[PDB]
């Protein structure tokens, strides 16, 4: 009785939302961007090959200085690389080798990692003794740590396989906010540029926009057919892109509350593990399971180029804050820098 | 260029430490321990988050990882074990009602694109419980697997001494149910090694060592171009 009524109310609400989205879908992004010239053939080349990881790389995050990057590989090592010179600045031995995510703090003083240990471990890169030690372990997730991003040196938001995201206070080690509503494993999170919102892509084929302070899900973005492994905010913060296992990338607009573009090709049948925009957002780079990265014209849904230099699964993808380069980490235990 | 030289020297020191750790890591055999709650997977070798079991056979160090603290949805975190030497799949062979669930899980592991190169060491656990279930006669496998009625014991089967033929037919039928999935796809890249075990068996570590030795031989053969 009550359950059936609630389900029927939910179905009517979903129909209302779908009708509203159709109402604001006066035109398509293809029609709006039909007159602007195509970007051509984007031919990025491998400038640096970061070697030293001896197992598959699961994640990488650029530092905000756009020179230092931290890479997480399942050899039990977090390597902080000086990408300009390929010098390894730090090699952090991890307590749990099954790391699935890493984050580089915007200050650059901290890195975080996590995975099957269900713990976000914060590592201080600026210790007085000059050695990297565990500054804080953030236990409390009942599932694997799939993504983590620092908001600052004191706050980090983490997405997990327990179908929830969590905002952590690093100083006290307590969850200041818990973000619930996903019915699948939350695979990725992307912070908005103002860090007041974040989008999370989960294994429920839906992307959810969350208010960081209010703590509830503002918007749910559906349209993907399979698990969303990757999520990335558009640089203006008013849109975001999703990478999923259905072999499609999709661009959703926050204010329009619907999918604006689908990035797919018939010969692509492999899932997307990682997505990142360029600085202007005109290029949507996506890492794939076919060992390649496809550069998508975000406004024309055309594959602008292919980053074909990896012998195994491209697990992670990162564009620098200044937009000079793309770092592509893969399961072949190598990170390549491209531009 | 003095601080640049210091950075290069620190990077080379880090490279040396990484090379030493990787040489140490390459000697350790990483194993994924999988199974249901009733499978008895925790007592196979008998030695929060992901639980690691370390055991050594003939100077070879094995790291068996029991992934606790995760939800029942495994399609994402099981991708982390793409590079393990073997997956130890433990099956409660006496629980007929959950044998199909174990078979579906084995089929998903076998045919997963990130797990199709990993050989599976199949431990058909609780053989004593299976034997007493078959001798009791209360529970019939044909009620859960109708093809058991048309099943005959293979000529290559090696029954234990003093083992009832119905028990042998049952255990080898469950083994062949898993091996039909194993031989249905991925021929050559990975192999399934079945073992009939009870809870009191103390040779499972040796069984894992022999199967992992076979796996490493085949991987080395693929590396050599001989296979």
């Amino acid at each position, epitope marked *: 009785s009550e359950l059936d009524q609630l389900r029927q109310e939910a179905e009517q609400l979903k129909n209302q939302i779908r009708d509203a989205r159709k109402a604001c879908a006066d035109a398509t992004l293809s029609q709006i961007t039909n007159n602007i010239d195509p970007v051509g053939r984007i031919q990025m080349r491998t400038r640096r090959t970061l070697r030293g990881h001896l197992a598959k790389i699961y994640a990488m995050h650029w530092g905000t200085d756009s020179r230092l990057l931290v890479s997480a590989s399942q050899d039990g090592k977090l390597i902080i690389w000086d990408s300009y010179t390929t010098n390894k600045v730090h090699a952090i031995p991890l307590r749990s080798s099954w790391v699935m995510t890493c984050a580089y703090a915007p200050s650059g003083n901290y890195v975080a990692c996590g995975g099957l240990d269900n713990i976000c471990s914060i590592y201080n890169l600026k210790t007085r003794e000059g050695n990297v030690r565990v500054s804080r372990e953030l236990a409390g997730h009942t599932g694997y740590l799939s993504c983590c991003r620092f908001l600052d040196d004191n706050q980090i938001v983490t997405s997990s396989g327990d179908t929830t995201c969590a905002l952590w206070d690093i100083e006290t080690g307590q969850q200041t906010t818990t973000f619930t509503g996903h019915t*699948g494993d939350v695979m990725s999170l992307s912070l908005a540029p103002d860090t007041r919102l974040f989008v999370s892509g989960a294994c429920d*084929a839906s992307a959810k926009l969350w208010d960081v302070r209010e703590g509830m899900c503002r918007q749910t973005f*559906t349209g993907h057919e399979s698990d969303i492994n990757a999520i990335c905010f558009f640089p203006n913060g008013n849109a975001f892109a999703t990478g999923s*296992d*259905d072999a499609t990338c999709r661009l959703f607009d926050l204010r329009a509350d619907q999918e604006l573009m689908t990035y797919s090709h018939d010969n692509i049948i492999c899932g997307i593990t990682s997505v990142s925009f360029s600085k202007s957002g005109r290029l949507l780079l996506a890492g794939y399971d076919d060992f390649n990265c496809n550069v998508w014209d975000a406004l024309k849904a055309d594959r602008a180029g292919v980053l074909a230099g990896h012998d195994n699964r491209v697990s992670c993808l990162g564009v620098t804050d200044d937009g000079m380069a793309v770092a592509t980490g893969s399961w072949d235990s190598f990170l390549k820098i491209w531009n | 260029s003095a601080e640049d030289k210091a950075a290069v020297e620190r990077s080379k020191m880090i490279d040396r430490n990484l090379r030493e750790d990787g040489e140490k890591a390459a000697r350790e055999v990483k194993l994924l321990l999988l199974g249901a709650d009733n499978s008895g997977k925790s007592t196979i070798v008998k030695q929060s988050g992901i639980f690691e079991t370390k055991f050594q056979v003939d100077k070879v160090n094995f790291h068996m990882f029991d992934v606790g603290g995760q939800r029942d949805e495994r*399609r994402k975190w*099981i991708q982390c074990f793409n590079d393990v030497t073997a997956i130890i799949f433990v099956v409660d062979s006496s629980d007929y009602n959950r044998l*199909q669930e174990a078979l579906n899980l084995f*089929k998903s592991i076998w045919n*997963n694109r990130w797990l199709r190169t990993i050989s599976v060491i199949l431990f058909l656990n609780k053989q004593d419980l299976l034997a007493e279930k078959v001798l009791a006669g209360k529970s019939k496998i044909e009620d859960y697997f109708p093809e058991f009625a048309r099943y005959t014991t293979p000529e290559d089967a090696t029954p234990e001494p003093g083992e009832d033929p119905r028990v042998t037919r049952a255990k080898y039928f469950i083994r062949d149910e898993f091996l039909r999935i194993s031989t249905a796809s991925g021929d050559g890249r990975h192999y399934c090694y079945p073992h009939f075990t009870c809870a009191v068996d103390t040779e499972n570590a040796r069984r894992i060592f022999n199967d992992v030795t076979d796996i490493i031989i085949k991987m080395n053969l693929r590396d050599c171009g001989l296979f």
Partner: nanobody
Amino acid sequence: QVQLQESGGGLVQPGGSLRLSCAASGFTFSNYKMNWVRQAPGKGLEWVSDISQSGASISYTGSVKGRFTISRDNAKNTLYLQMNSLKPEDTAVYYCARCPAPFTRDCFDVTSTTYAYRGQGTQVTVSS
């Protein structure tokens, strides 16, 4: 939005017949292997049957072999379970479960508790 809406369930006499239909929307139906799973009262989620993307590879759990017939209409985006010779042990909520990823032989997690690509289910009661 990936939607699975199952229908056709109801109260049936033992030995009776029932045709379960699932209307699938929000995804390319022909790209996914499709599943039927059961939720018996007091038991866990049990996989019943599966059909391949083309519809050629069909497998059933042994308790329903010869009695259940899975079929898919990829043109109509509908999954069918023709349930003949129904027994009281077949009484369960029947869920249509999509495999999580397209073009995959493996089908993980369709019997998990909070699996996303599974419908709300249709109650099938087989009693006199």
